[PDB]
């Protein structure tokens, strides 16, 4: 069996910018390599075979090189739109193996959340439940936290957290964090506090309601 | 014209088995092989094993071999995966995508060009429950506002949600689904200009294929 490893397996570049990956086989695979894109929520697309034979319908930007056990895979001038996790396939062998896949995102400027609270809705609070949302929308970069306070003490147990994958045309990230409650809980309390820390700001960015 | 159908989520016991299917149309059956390949949660491709339909003949990574078994019937165009006795560790998307059969010196054109949608299966034995659906609108005024719908409670993976039946898709974010003691929530965001709500109409659309549930749900302002 052919082993392929795949390196990096996480790459950051920015726009305009030009990105290189390798993948090594154990043996000689005599250029039957192919590259292929993994974009969120898709399946695969093939790009090229034979190390270097493109799709037709696949921007020229995109290359492949190499021989022997060592290939690499390249895109010269990165748009947003190529953001994904990329694979080496290895197909000289009855037996095909892919590598482990490397993870392409994209930089661009410093953007602060975009923060968003709601309240539980009518409809939930009659079946017995309560529920607050937050969502921290279109920032950069990728790292945050988030904390909830009600009446102003930090809850930790009862958080649900969601990242999205870096958006495709503007290379932000979107994150949902929901608190969920019950009624009688959230009834007992007025004030409800989503407070995020970022880098964009030195103390943090927070948003908050009062029940009444 | 080329296309490769997979079949419908299937959630498994743990210790049982299931069978996927993958029709085939728009090309000859029997001049490609099938190839099928898994895709976990966390973590890369994994190639599965090929069959030839026209023969009957298989091979499998050896990680495979004992666990998925490659068939097809000619007649109606169409492969098969049988997963036997699964686990958790199973628990994946399956793909189908063709390979072409014939032999050429640089090797053939046709490397997984084209490929099947994907067959989610989850191993658990946790119950297959509806979700609840409920709007996010908010308790301060821009010229863009923000609405949303929690999705809450179901079981299992995956849900559809869409806004005003497709046409707000602009300036969505629909969330990973995240697990909690056997139920899933997801939520999603869309944001529209504050002169367009709630003066005009915006309504989320879910759907729970394992559940029959459809549930449109009016987003109104908060009370
Ligand atoms: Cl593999």
């Known amino acids: 069996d052919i082993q392929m490893t795949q390196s990096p397996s996480s790459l950051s570049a920015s726009l305009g910018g030009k990105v290189t990956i390798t993948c090594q086989s154990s043996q000689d695979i005599n250029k039957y390599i192919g590259w292929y894109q993994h974009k969120p929520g898709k399946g695969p697309r093939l790009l090229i075979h034979y190390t270097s034979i493109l799709r037709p319908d696949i921007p020229s930007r995109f290359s492949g090189s190499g021989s022997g056990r060592d290939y690499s895979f390249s895109i010269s001038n990165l748009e947003p739109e190529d953001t994904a996790t990329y694979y080496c396939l290895q197909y000289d062998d009855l037996l095909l193996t892919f590598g482990a896949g490397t993870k392409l995102e994209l930089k661009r400027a410093d953007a602060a959340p975009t923060v968003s609270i709601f309240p539980p809705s009518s409809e939930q609070l009659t079946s017995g439940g309560a529920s607050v949302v937050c969502f921290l929308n279109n920032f950069y970069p990728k790292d945050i936290n988030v904390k909830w306070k009600i009446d102003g003490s930090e809850r930790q147990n009862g958080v649900l957290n969601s990242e999205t994958d870096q958006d495709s045309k503007d290379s932000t990230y979107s994150m949902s964090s929901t608190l969920t409650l019950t009624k009688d809980e959230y009834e007992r309390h007025n004030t409800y506090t989503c407070e995020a820390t970022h880098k964009t700001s030195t103390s943090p960015i927070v948003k908050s309601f009062n029940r009444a | 014209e080329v296309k490769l159908e997979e079949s419908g989520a299937e959630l498994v016991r743990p210790g049982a088995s299931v069978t996927l299917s993958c029709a085939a149309s728009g090309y000859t059956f029997t001049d490609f092989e099938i190839h099928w390949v898994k895709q976990p949660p966390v973590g890369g491709l994994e190639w599965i094993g090929t069959?030839?339909?026209?023969?009957?003949?298989?091979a499998y990574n050896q990680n495979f071999k004992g666990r998925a078994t490659l068939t097809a019937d000619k007649s109606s165009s169409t492969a098969y995966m049988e997963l036997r006795s699964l686990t958790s560790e199973d628990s994946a998307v399956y793909y189908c995508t063709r390979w072409g059969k014939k032999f050429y010196y640089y090797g053939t054109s046709y490397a997984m060009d084209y490929w099947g949608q994907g067959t989610s299966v989850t191993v658990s034995s946790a119950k297959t429950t509806p979700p609840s659906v409920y709007p996010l609108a908010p308790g301060a005024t821009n010229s863009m506002v923000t609405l949303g719908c929690l999705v809450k409670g179901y079981f299992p993976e995956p849900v559809t949600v869409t806004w005003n039946s497709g046409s707000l898709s602009g300036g969505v974010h629909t969330f990973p689904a995240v697990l909690q003691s056997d139920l899933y929530t997801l939520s999603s965001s869309v944001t529209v200009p504050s002169s367009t709500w709630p003066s005009e109409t915006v309504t989320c659309n879910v759907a729970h294929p394992a559940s029959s549930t459809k549930v449109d749900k009016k987003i109104v302002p908060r009370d």
């Open positions: 069959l030839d339909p026209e023969t009957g003949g298989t």
